[PDB]
Amino acid sequence: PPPIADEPLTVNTGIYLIECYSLDDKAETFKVNAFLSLSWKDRRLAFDPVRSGVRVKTYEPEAIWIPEIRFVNVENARDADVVDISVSPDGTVQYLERFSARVLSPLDFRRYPFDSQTLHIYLIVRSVDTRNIVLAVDLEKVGKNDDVFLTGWDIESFTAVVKPANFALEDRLESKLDYQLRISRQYFSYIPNIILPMLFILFISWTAFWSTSYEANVTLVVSTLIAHIAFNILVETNLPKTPYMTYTGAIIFMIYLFYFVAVIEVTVQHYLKVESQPARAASITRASRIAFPVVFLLANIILAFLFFGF
Amino acid sequence: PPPIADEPLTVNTGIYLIECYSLDDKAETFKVNAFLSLSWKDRRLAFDPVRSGVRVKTYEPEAIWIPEIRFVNVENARDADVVDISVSPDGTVQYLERFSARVLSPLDFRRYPFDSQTLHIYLIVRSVDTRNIVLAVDLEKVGKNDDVFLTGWDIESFTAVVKPANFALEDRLESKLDYQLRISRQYFSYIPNIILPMLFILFISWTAFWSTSYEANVTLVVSTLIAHIAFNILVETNLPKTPYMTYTGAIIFMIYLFYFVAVIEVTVQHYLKVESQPARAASITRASRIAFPVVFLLANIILAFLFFGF
Amino acid sequence: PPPIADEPLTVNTGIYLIECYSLDDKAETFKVNAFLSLSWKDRRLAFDPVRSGVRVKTYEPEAIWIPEIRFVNVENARDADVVDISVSPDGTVQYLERFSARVLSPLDFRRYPFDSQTLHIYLIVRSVDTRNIVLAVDLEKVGKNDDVFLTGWDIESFTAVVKPANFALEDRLESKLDYQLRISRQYFSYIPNIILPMLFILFISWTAFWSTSYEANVTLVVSTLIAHIAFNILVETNLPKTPYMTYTGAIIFMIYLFYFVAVIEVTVQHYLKVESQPARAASITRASRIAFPVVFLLANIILAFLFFGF
Amino acid sequence: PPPIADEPLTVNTGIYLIECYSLDDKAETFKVNAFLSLSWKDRRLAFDPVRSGVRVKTYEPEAIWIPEIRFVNVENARDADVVDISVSPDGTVQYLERFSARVLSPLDFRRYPFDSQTLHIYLIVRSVDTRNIVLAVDLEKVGKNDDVFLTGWDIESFTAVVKPANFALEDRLESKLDYQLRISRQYFSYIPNIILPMLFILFISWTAFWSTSYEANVTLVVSTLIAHIAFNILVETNLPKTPYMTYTGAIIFMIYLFYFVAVIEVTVQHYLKVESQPARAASITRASRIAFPVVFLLANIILAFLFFGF
Amino acid sequence: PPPIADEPLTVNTGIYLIECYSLDDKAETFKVNAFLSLSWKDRRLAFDPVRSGVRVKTYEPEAIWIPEIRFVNVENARDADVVDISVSPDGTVQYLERFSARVLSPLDFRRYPFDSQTLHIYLIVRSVDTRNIVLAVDLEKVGKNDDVFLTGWDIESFTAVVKPANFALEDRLESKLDYQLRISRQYFSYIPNIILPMLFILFISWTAFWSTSYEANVTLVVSTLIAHIAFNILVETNLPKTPYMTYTGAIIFMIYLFYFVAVIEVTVQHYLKVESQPARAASITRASRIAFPVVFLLANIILAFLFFGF
Ligand SMILES: [Cs+]
């Protein structure tokens, strides 16, 4: 029973994030518990203050006509319970629910551990024979308690795109809004657990430049390369099959090389010290002691600059 | 209360993929959130435009007769909420839901990491005493936003088989449609993480052709073979117990050999250099330095050509 | 409101497997989506063809009395939606649902990778004051599309035990039917991934019969025994804590021995070649080169014959 | 509308385990599908046999007053469908459902692989203004088909504590019953897969007493210690963070020592055979050859006796 | 239909924890099954004891006006079934449900294995045109059976913050309460499984101070460093990406160093014993034998004191 209008009836939205949780890097989703505030003029139940009752009349959903506000990027029918409905005298309705659905927003892992993110929540609404334009009321949209959680994420700002996008979707126009949740990752536990440990094994790898033994120079360069896959695999896991290249996937792969040419040098400091030419053997080996850490620290400024500095 | 017809009543379908997610290679399933558009002539509620009401009359499901459209390959009762029902004057009904069920479509892992896929969605409908033929309305079937996701898959096209298949199923005919979702895998993160790393270990394996020491030539060919199972097992995992052979399962298994005859050669460059015949030892070893990488690169052209080039 | 009979009313069943999926070796269960066809004479709503309506009258469940057909071995209340109900004039009712529950049938892993299986679906039905005997109508039981899936299983036949079993269960008799799904495993991906790889490591183990060095004869027999646990554990995982012995659990355990006596021989070819008696050392070692592969190939004909050939 | 009594109305319970499955050692829970039989005198619907109808009158739940029987230790609202309700003439009611909820019973892993267990199911019932005492009818409680499953567990007996416990819970007394399911584990697959394999690696560890080489005596004692953590971790996984000590957690930890002092001995048979005193070296080493296996077999009788024999 | 008051109507709450389970360190959530007791004066259904019926009248939810009590930090619409409603004569209502939702309370992993926790449950309630203040009745809040579980946690006390917090949330004030569950972790299974094993490998690492061989001094310091990542990774797993530093993450990382300088020393006891200056080699090596275990035991007093002792 939609509200007999004279033009496209505006509906006024608003979201108060109560809870934020379980951002799932692999699935690229997150759950959110929050308020959903709607409002519109339904002159059809304007109601004479003095003549009867009181300031505002409480209705049940079945009584009033209510605009079907569906979320766009959600796995399931959103999970809301209605909190209150209050009809002003002019025929203005005040709606409030408290939904909790899991949202499907994509993430950009280009700078993986040192990445910032922009999540999205949507709210389309399809028309009937009066058009429906949605729009935000920023007193109900300042939504985000001083308690929002999001484990392992710093939260930067909950804002929203005032101007909606009105679509042509199947002989009926809908109107879609963009609620933006901006976050930065708490990279850190990434260092004592992944970055640093990954680095130390790399250095011991090439302790084998200050050694003559092949027997102990494979037990060296090789034993570490194993340990590196332990880190490659640990990381390749809490992260999706990105069609692009990650920052960490970069240096985690750049590393694979300094083990290959490390295992190259130790191999050649042998078919060139068994060929009785240690003239050249402890010449190469001596150089590698600089070649490597420098090409590295250089390739990391080269790699690093390539990702953040552009 | 089915619509008194004069022939097999056509029902007009259509699916608008809103979301696609969680393609599960192991289970061979995927979840999809999408619209379901139906329509048919139910002359029984044709309704005199001028005489009453308006252009089109909105009903509730309980009011109208509605065709039971069940999905064929689905784990559970599909999870749909009804979006709108609009009855045209001629007795034509316009239905729209927004379901989200997980689909059971099989996948072909013959070219695993470099494989393209064809997923299926079904929609049977059983008859009563008027027959039901289903069919597609391609304005409601262009379904697939410019936002469909499918992590780690490039999506090629959402089309559908115009001509249905009408079955004889238990003294009542049903009519079944084929909605096709075509995708190609984003192989790539397969290289820096599986292909390349798997290769590197294979090369170091056979650095042991340029060495005399057995002590460091097992610490060599053996230490890597371990690391290979790390990749055999990493892969054997995100992939089902196929009754056929995978491309990667092939070369991952072809590899097992070049470690066996690699461990053969180093073993024989010993009971043939302890038998004081290093005449032959550093003859064999010298050859293997070519035999191997060539038999390989040859066996990979032989293997590769065998899978894609036919 | 049960159908006033003169004897135990027969109810006629039938199952049309639409989908089969997710057979879970560890949990010993499987999910199935299928039709459930029932029928019985309820003379109480026989209904005068000519006098009124039409050939057959469509009812809703609430209208008719319906026999509660519960599945026996199922995790949960089975998940069915009703497809159609049609009452013949003689008072004969025609019922069809389309359930999908996960079944708890046990499996026999005695021949694990080369095992064939027999799954079960049950359907009891408890009596009131007329007795209920169930029985099958084989036109509705030929159920199993030419599309049944069951990843990694070849499917042999869907049949069912015509004669039911009528129990005495709590002062009321029930009647239970046996629907049989026969399957064979697609062993194969078991070879290039488990059998073969497990074998190769075993052979390299005992490359250490053609070697003098203990240093490289432990880096040999020992380095492989590790890799074997990688396969013992990979297999011990996708398989339940069976109270009996598996075929693969057998040879996977028979193997553990040929590494123990292999590590025995290499150990004794040392406290018997450091005791300056290489007379005996390269005597034993020379024998083991045959002893082993033969005792093995013999113990596998002995083991193999013991499991399949009896 | 509760049955106007003259004293605390007794309700007569009973559980017929139809299915048992998925005992989850880590979570300490299990799922059960079973009957639930209740009965009580509600003289308020006693009903004159001859005067009307028949022997017993079938009602729907909404008709009769029914005692709310909630399970105590359950994750969720239990999942029951009602099977039949039959009211005797004296006003005696006969109820039967067929629930299936997952039960939260704790387990005692003190003897882990060789442990027996006692599971629990509960059924409280809160009072109104007539008191409710629950109690069991052992014809409906002999519940447990000759088909109960419980993968990897032998099932010993389904009994129940006749005498209930009546609580004072919030100004209303409740009455709680104890249904006991006793089981023993099928330890076995624990041997060829965990115990035995764990033992063999331990023996090879200390093959290094019959060797002089340190190079091959670390490749020995160390290479196995790795393989042991593979078993420590395999086991530490299918088992909860117990605040006590397991039998297997014991010997799996007692083992860690015989590797430490094994790695001690081989280390000292070196800074005491480089120090030109092989007088003492191949003295110690010679002893360890007995010291170890004996201290062990002794420590296992000491450990074993400590756990089962007390 | 809210109770016509003269001031802000107080509602009296209370929670009786029946079950506690599945505290999920990674997700920072826990499930709880419990009673929810509410009460308030609704003089509007005060009801003349003598004049009619009895002491207290039982209603159904639809009958009475009931305050919507929503939980704040919960994933979903809380999962409650209503247990009883009893209206006193003065118009006082007595409500009791038995909900079971999973709660989103944050945890502080600063002292990870030796950490104590404070969980939260919330209950807001939004106002209409009478204000609602919530408050606790400590006879119904002594809630926590003598059976509360919480695997791997010792439970210290269930209390609650008497004084509520009344918000200004969207032109309507709400009232929120704080129910506190205090717990301590059962660290312990952390020792025989993580702390101790992690330590032992560290000690063997530096058995290489009493050795001359580089070949066996890498097979030493290196083979252990691998095993350490096995523990770094085992722990980094059952623990969230904390933006701060854990105690165990500390010493697990402090450890990475004593392997680096350990692998430093063994490397330098070589380019300084091949440079014929074993004067200095077995001088350094001799010192490290003390330097290390002391700097460590000192750095652990330094680290330890830094975390708990402040
Ligand atoms: Cs080695």
From Swiss-Prot, chains A, B, C, D, E:
InterPro entries on file: GABAA/Glycine_rcpt, Neur_chan_lig-bd, Neur_chan_lig-bd_sf, Neur_channel, Neuro-gated_channel_TM_sf, Neuro_actylchol_rec
Molecular function terms from GO: extracellular ligand-gated monoatomic ion channel activity; identical protein binding; potassium channel activity; sodium channel activity; transmembrane signaling receptor activity
Role, per record: Cationic channel with similar permeabilities for Na(+) and K(+), that is activated by an increase of the proton concentration on the extracellular side. Displays no permeability for chloride ions. Shows slow kinetics of activation, no desensitization and a single channel conductance of 8 pS. Might contribute to adaptation to external pH change.
Protein name per UniProt: Proton-gated ion channel
Quaternary structure and interacting proteins, as annotated: Homopentamer.
GO cellular component, one term: plasma membrane
Other facts: The homologous nature of GLIC to eukaryotic nicotinic acetylcholine receptors and other eukaryotic pentameric ligand-gated ion channels, and its sensitivity to general anesthetics, define GLIC as a structural and functional model of signal transduction in the nervous system, also relevant for exploring the molecular basis of anesthetic action.
Reported effect, residue 248 to A: Marked gain of function, with a ten-fold shift of the proton dose-response curve towards lower concentrations. Also shows slower apparent rate constants for activation and deactivation
Periplasmic side: 1-186, 238-245
Membrane topology classification: Multi-pass membrane protein
Domain description: Consists of an N-terminal ligand-binding domain that encloses a wide aqueous vestibule and a transmembrane domain that forms a narrow channel.
Organism, as annotated: Gloeobacter violaceus (strain ATCC 29082 / PCC 7421)
Family that this chain belongs to: Belongs to the ligand-gated ion channel (TC 1.A.9) family.
Keyword annotations of the record: Cell inner membrane, Cell membrane, Ion channel, Ion transport, Ligand-gated ion channel, Membrane, Potassium, Potassium channel, Potassium transport, Receptor, Signal, Sodium, Sodium channel, Sodium transport, Transmembrane, Transmembrane helix, Transport
Pfam families on file: Neur_chan_LBD
Activity control mechanisms: Tetraethylammonium (TEA) and tetrabutylammonium (TBA) inhibit the proton-activated currents in a dose- and voltage-dependent manner in vitro, whereas the blocker of acid sensing ion channels, amiloride, has no effect. Channel current of GLIC can be inhibited by inhaled and intravenous general anesthetics at and below concentrations used clinically. Ion conduction is also inhibited by lidocaine and by divalent transition metal ions such as cadmium ions.
Localisation per UniProt entry: Cell inner membrane
